[PDB]
Design a protein around this ligand. Structure first.
Ligand SMILES: O=c1nc(NO)ccn1[C@@H]1O[C@H](COP(=O)(O)O)[C@@H](O)[C@H]1O
Ligand SMILES: O=c1nc(NO)ccn1[C@@H]1O[C@H](COP(=O)(O)O)[C@@H](O)[C@H]1O
Ligand SMILES: [Cl-]
Ligand SMILES: [Cl-]
Lengths: 256, 256
């Protein structure tokens, strides 16, 4: 079990994973904020206020009512100032020829500003191969969806194993997984886990929740992704701090 | 085998599926153009020129460099003048609360203009449940992705069967499937098949092509989806007519 700091130095580490690991160590945070908001001013207010507490901000640019590239330019200034990576949760899941265009072009120009994106593995490795053509020149990384937090998820068994294999065969671009627990023993790969809250439960339209101690300390994941557990709290600063301390202490416990 | 006209009257038949089947009958076309272009001017010129040859125009709004809602308003007008449905190939693939905002809101407001959208089934029925909450009041329909055309597709076997059962359980919203062949015996469901060209082959990023005669005649799908086979030809109108004749003649042949 290596520290984040030491994994940032592994000979085979991807530069983006290495950059994320060094900043998680420096800032003592393994918390990704799911910035699930509809206005650009909310997204920038949250990134500025909660930046110090997080290693990563996860966006859904396609839910922003007033997206412009100038919003993303301002987000990058905040990511650079407070030191976190930007993860656009686009869940690419088309053939390689189409995802390449969806990643580089259209109105969002996602590769122009997202350090990380994710993809489903259901199309086969072409999905990774098309993204890579755009993301490698721009020094970008991708996470593959190995498992899902939601009820009825088909991302189990042989499907998870295919995501892991795909990741090993594309490690110049794939830096880890979205998953509910550690799915690879290779320490170069990051594991990010959504469906996290301090309290048990907690469905609604299919989502399921586990605590930071369970997913970090017991299930061996690296980073927790939290949206509503922070964003719906009265005091989002205190809430972000609670999740950061929970996830950081669970990670320390695991190192022994 | 029922004709398209007759299927338009199955009792169990969605009104969107009915509208589509009647216009396929009337126009003698079971061709969906995949309008994979990056400029509004080209998208709308193809929509107008090829409108008479197709039953459906399939978009990737997120690759359109000069997207505005005014462009989609013009597309609706051509869909009404020429009679074809608009299918946004967004491959929704997220938890329920997320996909509902991806469908209704953001800059694209997909539900406001797209007759049809599609979704992956990997997250479980939560994906359909989120879209359906938006789509039912707006009298929209959805396709589920039961199979994929690309090398390495994990949409096979139990996965595909999971997709069919999900469509059965959400039949007031789900109008059929994206798949390589007939996956359901119910004639109320439509089957639309991408990965189609007159020539055997593939691209350099995992796309595989089969002929109209193979997919409509032998595999018993309903509609061919064709992008490059048409968009790359010098005369896209001639090309769309070749594909329309081929798919329609193949449909006649399966009817005896
Ligand atoms: O990163 C993810 N990986 C997923 N695969 O399981 C699924 C959802 N997500 C996103 O993680 C966020 C979790 O939010 P809540 O903590 O339930 O409010 C949402 O924006 C989801 O769309
Ligand atoms: O190729 C696909 N395969 C699918 N499943 O295999 C689903 C949709 N598509 C879309 O179908 C179109 C096929 O394009 P070509 O016909 O391969 O240019 C593209 O826009 C793809 O994104
Ligand atoms: Cl890597
Ligand atoms: Cl491939």
């Amino acid at each position: 079990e290596l520290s984040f700091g030491a994994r940032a130095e592994l000979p085979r580490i991807h530069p983006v994973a290495s950059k994320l690991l060094r900043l998680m160590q420096k800032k003592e945070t393994n918390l990704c904020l799911s910035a699930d908001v509809s206005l650009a001013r909310e997204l920038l207010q949250l990134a500025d206020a909660l930046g110090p507490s997080i290693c990563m901000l996860k966006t859904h640019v396609d839910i922003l009512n007033d997206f412009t590239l100038d919003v993303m330019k301002e987000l990058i200034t905040l990511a650079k100032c407070h030191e976190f990576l930007i993860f656009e949760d686009r869940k690419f899941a088309d053939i390689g020829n189409t995802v390449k265009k969806q990643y580089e072009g259209g109105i969002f120009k996602i590769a122009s500003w997202a350090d990380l994106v994710n993809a489903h593995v259901v199309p086969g490795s072409g999905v990774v191969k098309g993204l890579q053509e755009v993301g490698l020149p721009l020094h970008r990384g991708c996470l593959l969806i190995a498992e899902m937090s939601s009820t009825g998820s088909l991302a189990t068994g042989d499907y998870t194993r295919a995501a892991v294999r795909m990741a090993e065969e594309h490690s110049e671009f794939v830096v880890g997984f979205i998953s509910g627990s550690r799915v690879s023993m290779k320490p170069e790969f990051l594991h990010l886990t959504p469906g996290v809250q301090l309290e048990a439960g907690g469905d609604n339209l299919g989502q399921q929740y586990n605590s930071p101690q369970e997913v970090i300390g017991k299930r061996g994941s690296d980073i927790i992704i939290v949206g509503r557990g922070i964003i719906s709290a009265a005091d989002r600063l205190e809430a972000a701090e609670m999740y950061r301390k929970a996830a950081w202490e669970a990670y320390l416990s695991r190192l022994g």
